[PDB]
């Protein structure tokens, strides 16, 4: 009925700006399973869902996945505490619009956690690279001792390996404790996170370990219900000092469900 | 809990503007008793309540009647139909703010019905003029055959007379079918209307009769719960072609509860 993360919306008449508000609570759905330094945090994947959910609620469209996310900047983490209120704005047209996502302090104070640009979706267009099998329980234990406390709902990497070139290949499910409310989302945050987790298994990321979290997306393309995905493939390079990656999520028939052109990564104390 | 006319509010973060929305329905409270040309209409008094209710919901204040209404312009009538959505904006500070009240067409179309300026309240500062007693049932029958179909809830003028100078003096109650929800209001719309009805008994107004409705208020001062009022005194002059009046509502001890410095009146087809 109502989106659990975005909430209900009203268009301000003074300007074309549409404004949403929703109440977040750690006992909400599966938010409790995402934890950094013992703090329940809203995962960066979730801002993508909110942006897309916002665009779909403003404009009449006839499709299933009509939007791509041009850009998405993660400004500062959202410590999910009880009585957290999430305020979201949208401004633009059916071709291109900007979304801003915030926490609310009282009634007239806001802290913006992320900004996204949504636009009309673009339609989808044996070698010396052998795999070395890896234990998923090794990964979820490395970053569990580095701050990232992924719970049951976020432990979707069930098979993992990495090529000679350094690319990470993972087999992924959406865990049983995360398919409640799944139908509410266009781009299931938990699943997108699971796709993004693979980047932490690349040779680039592992040659560091502190943990390494996302801070920017560009070119998030959704071509279907990403929960139907089963194999995620992520590569992480380094250009400048910025860690820039790319991941691809494909269903059982190797069809792309989610494609993320860029993912800028960074370290966290 | 929630104001039946103003509704629930959210502050848009892009600008300081606060935005309310509420659902109006003719079977709402006593809206059905106010009728013009067989159409349920929101009475002009109600926009005053909405403006004050809006100001009180934006700002922290310690009083009972902290606001006066500097001005209030009635732009076009609101035909109350089922599923009517009333959108209200507020912009300013605790000293002076502007309110705009609208109907909503869909999700991105509005029709503004009234605009008001609210400001900090200013604190309260035998002759040849004999009365001629009048029948209240004569008044409510004159304007009932001219378009104004006041129902049970709006028939508060229970005693009426008019001086030699042309001033109208009325004894007023708040009818039994209108004290449901009374506690929700700061400035009970039905009562304010009843105060304003007196102007239709002045020598100026009667020397016309079509009916004569308000279109502008200035200097609406509220000094208490106006339902405690019992005697309303209204005078209507004519300067230029505009019909400009003034009414005063006083409680049992002759203490002013409501004072309206100006009321511009006009005819309606």
């Amino acid at each position: 009925d109502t989106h659990p993360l975005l909430g209900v919306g009203v268009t301000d008449p003074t300007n074309g700006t549409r404004v949403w508000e929703s109440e977040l609570d750690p006992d909400l759905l599966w938010l409790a399973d995402f934890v950094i330094d013992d703090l329940v945090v809203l995962p960066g994947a979730a801002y993508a869902e909110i942006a897309l959910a916002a665009a779909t609620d403003t404009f009449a469209v006839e499709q299933d996945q009509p939007w791509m996310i041009s850009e998405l900047d993660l400004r500062q983490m959202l410590h999910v505490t009880p009585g957290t209120v999430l305020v979201t704005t949208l401004t633009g047209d059916e071709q291109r619009c900007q979304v801003e996502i915030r926490t609310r302090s009282g009634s007239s104070g806001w802290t913006t956690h992320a900004t996204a640009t949504v636009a009309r979706a673009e339609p989808l267009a044996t070698t010396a690279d052998l795999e070395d099998q890896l234990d998923p329980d090794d990964l979820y234990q490395r970053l569990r001792g580095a701050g990232q406390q992924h719970g049951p709902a976020f432990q979707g990497i069930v098979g993992l390996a990495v090529t000679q070139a350094g690319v990470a290949r993972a087999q992924v499910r959406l865990p049983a404790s995360a398919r409640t409310g799944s139908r509410e989302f266009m781009l299931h945050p938990v699943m997108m996170d699971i796709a993004l987790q693979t980047l932490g298994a690349t040779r680039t990321a592992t040659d560091l370990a502190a943990l390494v979290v996302p801070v920017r997306f560009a070119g998030v393309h959704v071509y279907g219900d990403i929960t139907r995905g089963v194999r995620a493939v992520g590569s992480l390079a380094a250009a400048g000092d910025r860690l820039v990656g790319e991941v691809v999520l494909t269903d059982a028939n190797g069809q792309p469900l989610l494609v993320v052109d860029e993912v800028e990564m960074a370290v966290l104390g």
Side-chain angles (χ1 to χ4, degrees), chain A:
Chain A
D1 32 331
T2 310
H3 201 276
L5 296 181
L6 177 62
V8 54
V10 298
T11 303
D12 175 12
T14 48
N15 52 14
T17 306
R18 187 159 174 89
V19 189
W20 290 265
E21 92 175 17
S22 94
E23 325 198 32
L24 299 189
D25 225 89
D27 70 311
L28 175 63
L29 284 170
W30 35 253
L31 274 60
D33 284 355
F34 197 90
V35 162
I36 303 177
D37 291 317
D38 299 320
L39 298 161
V40 174
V41 161
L42 202 77
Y47 300 117
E49 168 59 33
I50 294 163
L52 293 166
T56 311
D57 182 42
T58 301
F59 307 107
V61 282
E62 316 240 288
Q63 219 146 325
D64 262 32
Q65 294 293 348
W67 314 115
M68 58 167 282
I69 308 188
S70 305
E71 321 171 30
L72 174 26
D73 269 90
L74 305 176
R75 292 255 217 104
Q76 91 168 76
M77 308 204 138
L78 193 179
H79 174 26
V80 182
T81 59
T84 297
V85 165
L86 194 100
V87 183
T88 308
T89 48
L90 190 155
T91 65
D93 45 43
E94 73 281 0
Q95 293 306 123
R96 184 198 200 233
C97 61
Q98 278 79 15
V99 173
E100 200 158 344
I101 312 184
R102 311 150 153 105
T103 7
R104 202 222 278 141
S105 187
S107 34
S108 315
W110 306 273
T111 313
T112 97
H113 289 309
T115 41
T117 305
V118 182
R120 271 286 154 72
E122 304 168 1
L124 182 43
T126 60
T127 319
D129 62 344
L130 296 325
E131 304 183 356
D132 312 21
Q133 302 301 303
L134 255 157
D135 199 341
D137 294 326
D138 280 339
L139 177 73
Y140 287 121
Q141 188 52 41
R142 176 243 307 276
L143 48 74
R144 181 173 262 274
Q148 274 251 59
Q149 187 153 303
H150 290 101
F154 275 86
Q155 290 168 220
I157 285 180
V158 70
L160 176 72
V162 45
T163 70
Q164 296 300 116
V167 175
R169 313 187 68 88
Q171 311 177 16
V172 302
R173 72 149 71 96
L174 176 63
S177 55
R179 31 248 306 228
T180 328
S182 10
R183 328 91 134 166
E184 313 258 34
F185 311 118
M186 304 177 61
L187 174 79
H188 202 294
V190 183
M191 196 76 235
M192 169 172 265
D193 192 71
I194 290 160
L196 292 163
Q197 299 186 15
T198 63
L199 289 169
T202 58
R203 183 142 56 79
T204 288
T206 52
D207 275 13
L208 301 179
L211 40 51
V212 189
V213 310
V215 298
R216 176 194 157 73
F217 308 134
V220 183
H221 306 266
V222 204
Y223 302 117
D225 170 25
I226 67 166
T227 48
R228 223 138 33 65
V230 278
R231 306 207 85 263
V233 191
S235 50
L236 187 55
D241 70 282
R242 290 145 288 264
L243 283 11
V244 190
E246 146 177 308
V247 330
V248 189
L249 178 85
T250 41
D251 61 13
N253 299 103
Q255 227 63 47
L257 294 179
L258 170 69
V259 182
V260 186
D261 302 345
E262 306 196 33
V263 178
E264 199 167 315
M265 306 273 287
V267 191
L268 181 89

